[PDB]
Design a protein around this ligand. Structure first.
Ligand SMILES: [Mg+2]
Ligand SMILES: [Mg+2]
Ligand SMILES: [Mg+2]
Ligand SMILES: [Mg+2]
Ligand SMILES: [Mg+2]
Ligand SMILES: [Mg+2]
Ligand SMILES: [Mg+2]
Ligand SMILES: [Mg+2]
Ligand SMILES: [Mg+2]
Ligand SMILES: [Mg+2]
Ligand SMILES: [Mg+2]
Ligand SMILES: [Mg+2]
Ligand SMILES: [Mg+2]
Ligand SMILES: [Mg+2]
Ligand SMILES: [Mg+2]
Ligand SMILES: [Mg+2]
Ligand SMILES: [Mg+2]
Ligand SMILES: [Mg+2]
Ligand SMILES: [Mg+2]
Lengths: 187, 52, 147, 129, 52, 52, 127, 122
RNA sequence: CGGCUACCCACCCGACCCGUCUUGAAACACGGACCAAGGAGUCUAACACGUGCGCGAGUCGGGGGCUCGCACGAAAGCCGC
RNA sequence: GAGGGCGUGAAACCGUUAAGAGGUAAACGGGUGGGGUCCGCGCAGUCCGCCCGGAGGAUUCAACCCGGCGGCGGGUCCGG
């Protein structure tokens, strides 16, 4: 024997993208070449986000993609998103900003072309910026998923605020013992 | 993504002067794995069950 | 797909993924929700609080039909009518305001949120909230009750 | 002296026994193919000395000398003239092997085309009149 | 007899597969790699007259 | 029956052409373009094998 | 391609009806083609064979230029027997060789008023 | 769209004999038997191949026209060369070198033409 | 002349009969005379999680309707006041 | 070598022939040795592909140009 330590062979990583999308594989090839040949950590992170799954790339929203450009210093920069930018029903005004994302929805593309912006894809973003200069890489609201609101140390023991599974949210379904002090214990 | 012109052929094989612009269905993207998925599910739709 | 099944991979192993010592035979713990109070209390408690007991009143012959009131927010209040309508109605013409009726859209109660611009409208609904009514008064619109 | 292929080294296999199954000698219901025993008391699984050896990853042959015939080629099976003529580019390392269900009338044409294209065939003088 | 035989597909994916198949029918390399004899055949997708 | 990317399908109700992921998808042209080869490190083709 | 849904493509059902068809169906099964001059003279493709038809055999062990008259038609065995076609047994007794009537070219038919009506219906339906 | 064509054709095609050994394309216009990307005669806009002549004497060369795509009746132009093996080897060398047309697979075309001129003479 | 090998024999060394209840099996623990065929984690409903695809504040025709009668058509295509 | 439960005809088991062996019940793993069947080849005699200096022979292009169609490349983006 040599290694007195435990044997953890592979750390965590996903090397090749599990998706069989040919377009995603071509983008993986192109951004892998740029990541290993341009010394660009932007291309490193975008290549890792292309290795990243469908679920861990949450859909970006149009109001958030406006507000992350409304901050000072983001006038002429391009909002690069590895993921989808969708419509928002809340917004009223759209600026003249540039979009570089995968699979922008139809109403979002329509409102951006009415507002006067320019949407791109990753090959056009690579032709315009090999190292990724003038870009801001954005990500979406992961923790607001319905799946993540069931996740915690417990459903209710220091009251725990983590949403136990039930059919119908209301009366007669999980509201009696441990949910109030009058009927048994209370958390 | 440009739309070229394809000639219309007669019953003898000679190219006629009638030229129709290529529609965008032939410029649409190609996803053979999605074709394989939908083809598999329609083949599952396309069968009598079997003996019980 | 039986070719992608774990059973096809586990051919050759004797106990087949369930151990030689424990011997999972038929139903070792019971059936279904068996032992909800006696011996599975650490799984019915600590994972489903509230499962045992009565909670309140008992409305005999209840319907999910009389309490039908789908709520609309002030964010959703604008897109019930098209954007062309509000632009061509508030393109610097006069003090006229378009009517946004939520009853035709299928919503009954207007609730209060943010993002309500300067251009006032007239909202007709069967119910309102005081916050949404104050937001409509602040942007200058008119409140109309219908039935 | 037939075709004399390229530089092929001393091909070793690191053992050449094609390991037998435990207690295949005692029972003739047991085929001689290997099958990993998963018993709780078996000496073969416990790897006692003097017993049989289990096939593991250590018996892997070299990648240079992998799938190598003793003549120096690598075999590739052939049914007809197109699958014979696909070996036109790599005939000095990859030899042909006519399928068993090929009749003699087409087999003589396949071996004649292999002799024209200088492709080694493993069975040149078989199933002939 | 109550095995889950028939599998519903989304109609957007059905139309997606139709568009992908019609787009892949236009490239000559794909159809020659499927195996149709397009040696002496004239220009891709062939359009014949209304007298046919 | 399907439409271009400008107009919708007139025969179908609510169908459009899908989103095209890579518009100008010539990967050889992209990797041999001067804008990409301007921003490359150096061709490092040395092997640096094991030294006894 | 079969389009009428009231007729089988089933192999078991077709073989069942074929090997259990009654004799008036087996007469239609045991039909034989005609020579080229006789089909030119009568304008008909094929006729069912009977006891007094002259037969030239085109295929089998006996082939060609052997125009003979048949003697028996076993519709149970789907076999006609020809007077010229012989085969000796072990004990020197001759016996007729089994010949299927689909491998049979009729050179001379039997003249009968019923067969004239059949031939007229064949010619009128062939048109 | 050549990379799309390669990512579709590199599996699930009516080629690519993956039968217990290495992969062969067999690819009726090709220069090497390996189903690779740099050696491919159906996908690229510029393709080179050499074939035996139908008369039994000489080598025919099939090169893609590149002036017209999706029109396979005129997409391949052919030539018939019957020389004393060195003049035609220099001819295919000048035809590939002195043009822009496929600076890759020079040695592929040269080795296949040389092997077929050896196999054709006795 | 050369040849490893599912051929046979001899010699040196090691080597108790497999499967599982067990802390412990070669056991004076149990099943197994031998051989050929069959033979054991499937399917439905529901839930949860992970992954892949489509659309995306929307999504879904599984319920019906429309096409000319079609072998594959018990499929597929479409509805949208 | 299809002879009336008759296509194909394995294993368990039995009979004969051929080879080998036999006091530590038979059988097995590692290592060799001996014998036998079989395989590839000629066993003091088996290597090829290129270039150049020598010896005879028959040919026609290539070196340069005229004649010819077909393909690559780019400028006036010339005519459209
Ligand atoms: Mg170690
Ligand atoms: Mg370990
Ligand atoms: Mg295990
Ligand atoms: Mg258990
Ligand atoms: Mg143990
Ligand atoms: Mg049947
Ligand atoms: Mg027990
Ligand atoms: Mg005990
Ligand atoms: Mg034991
Ligand atoms: Mg006992
Ligand atoms: Mg015992
Ligand atoms: Mg016993
Ligand atoms: Mg079995
Ligand atoms: Mg999921
Ligand atoms: Mg028999
Ligand atoms: Mg037999
Ligand atoms: Mg038979
Ligand atoms: Mg026997
Ligand atoms: Mg003896």
């Amino acid at each position: 024997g040599v290694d007195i330590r435990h044997n953890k062979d592979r750390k965590v990583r996903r090397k090749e993208p599990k998706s069989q999308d040919i377009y995603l594989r071509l983008l993986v090839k192109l951004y892998r070449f740029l990541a290993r040949r341009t010394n660009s950590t932007f291309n490193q992170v975008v290549l890792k986000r292309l290795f990243m799954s469908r679920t861990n790339r949450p859909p970006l929203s149009l109001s958030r993609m406006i507000r992350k450009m409304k901050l000072p210093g983001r006038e002429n920069k391009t909002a690069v998103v590895v993921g989808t930018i969708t419509d928002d029903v809340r917004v009223q005004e759209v600026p003249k900003l540039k979009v570089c994302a995968l699979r922008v929805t139809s109403r979002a593309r329509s409102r951006i072309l009415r507002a006067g912006g320019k949407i791109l894809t990753f090959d056009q973003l690579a032709l315009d910026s090999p190292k990724g200069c003038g870009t801001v890489l954005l990500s979406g609201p992961r923790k607001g998923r319905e799946v993540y609101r069931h996740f915690g140390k417990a459903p209710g023991t220091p009251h725990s605020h983590t949403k136990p599974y039930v059919r119908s949210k209301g009366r007669k379904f999980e509201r009696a013992r441990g949910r109030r002090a009058s009927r048994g214990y209370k958390n | 993504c440009a739309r070229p012109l394809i000639s219309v052929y007669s019953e003898k094989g000679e190219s006629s002067g009638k030229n129709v612009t290529l529609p965008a269905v032939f410029k649409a993207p190609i996803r053979p794995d999605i074709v394989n998925f939908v083809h598999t599910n329609l083949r599952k739709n396309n069968r009598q069950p079997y003996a019980v | 797909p039986s070719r992608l099944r774990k059973t096809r991979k586990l051919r050759g192993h004797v106990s087949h993924g369930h151990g030689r010592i424990g011997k999972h035979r038929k139903h070792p713990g019971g059936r279904g929700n068996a032992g909800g109070l006696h011996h599975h209390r650490i799984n019915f408690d600590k994972y489903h609080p509230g499962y045992f007991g009565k909670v309140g009143m008992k409305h005999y012959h209840l319907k999910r039909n009389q309490s039908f009131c789908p709520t609309v927010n002030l964010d959703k209040l604008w897109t019930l009518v098209s954007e062309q309508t509000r632009v061509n109605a508030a393109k610097n013409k006069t003090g006229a305001a378009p009517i946004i009726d939520v009853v035709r859209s299928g919503y009954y109660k207007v609730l209060g949120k943010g993002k309500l611009p300067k251009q006032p409208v007239i909202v007709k609904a069967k119910f309102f909230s005081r916050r949404a009514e104050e937001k409509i008064k602040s942007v200058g619109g008119a409140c109309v009750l219908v039935a | 002296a037939a075709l004399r292929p390229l530089v092929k080294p001393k091909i070793v296999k690191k053992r050449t026994k094609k390991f037998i199954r435990h207690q295949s000698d005692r029972y003739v219901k047991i085929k001689r193919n290997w099958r990993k025993p998963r018993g709780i008391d078996n000496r073969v699984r416990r790897r006692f000395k003097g017993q049989i050896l289990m096939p593991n990853i250590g018996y892997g042959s070299n990648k240079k000398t992998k799938h190598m015939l003793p003549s120096g080629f690598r075999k590739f099976l052939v049914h007809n003239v197109k699958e014979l003529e696909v070996l036109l580019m790599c005939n000095k390392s990859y030899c042909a092997e006519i399928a068993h269900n090929v009749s003699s009338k087409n087999r003589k044409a396949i071996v004649e085309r292999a002799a024209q294209l200088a492709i080694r065939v493993t069975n040149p003088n078989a199933r002939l009149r | 007899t109550w095995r889950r035989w028939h599998r519903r597909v989304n109609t957007t994916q059905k139309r997606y597969a139709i568009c992908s198949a019609l787009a892949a029918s236009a490239l000559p390399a794909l159809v020659m790699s499927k195996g149709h004899r397009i040696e002496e055949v004239p220009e891709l997708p062939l359009v014949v007259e209304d007298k046919v | 029956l399907y439409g271009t990317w400008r107009k919708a399908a007139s025969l179908k109700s609510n169908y459009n052409l899908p989103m095209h992921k890579m518009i100008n998808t010539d990967l050889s042209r992209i990797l041999k373009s001067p804008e990409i080869q301007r921003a490359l490190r150096a061709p490092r083709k040395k092997i640096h094998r094991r030294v006894l | 391609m079969k389009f009428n849904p009231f007729v089988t493509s089933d192999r078991s059902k077709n073989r069942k009806r074929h090997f259990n068809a009654p004799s008036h169906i087996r007469r239609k099964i045991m039909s034989s083609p005609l020579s080229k001059e006789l089909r030119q003279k009568y304008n008909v493709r094929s006729m069912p064979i009977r006891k007094d038809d002259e037969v030239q055999v085109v295929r089998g062990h006996y082939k060609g230029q052997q125009i003979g008259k048949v003697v028996q038609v076993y519709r149970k065995k789907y076999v006609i027997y020809i007077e010229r076609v012989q085969r000796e047994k072990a004990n020197g007794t001759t016996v007729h060789v089994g010949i299927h009537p689909s491998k049979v070219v009729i050179t001379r038919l039997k003249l009968d008023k019923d067969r004239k009506k059949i031939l007229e219906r064949k010619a009128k339906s062939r048109q | 769209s050549a990379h799309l064509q390669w990512m579709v054709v590199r599996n699930c095609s009516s080629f690519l004999i993956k039968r217990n050994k290495q992969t062969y394309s067999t690819e009726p216009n090709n220069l090497k038997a390996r189903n690779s990307f740099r050696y491919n005669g159906l996908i690229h806009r510029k393709t080179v191949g050499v074939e035996p002549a139908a008369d039994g004497k000489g080598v025919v060369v099939v090169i893609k026209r590149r002036s017209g795509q999706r029109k396979p009746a005129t997409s391949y132009v052919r030539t018939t060369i019957n020389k004393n093996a060195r003049a035609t080897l220099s001819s295919i060398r000048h035809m590939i070198r002195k043009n822009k047309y496929r600076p890759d697979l020079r040695m592929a075309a040269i080795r296949r033409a040389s092997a077929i001129l050896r196999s054709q003479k006795p």
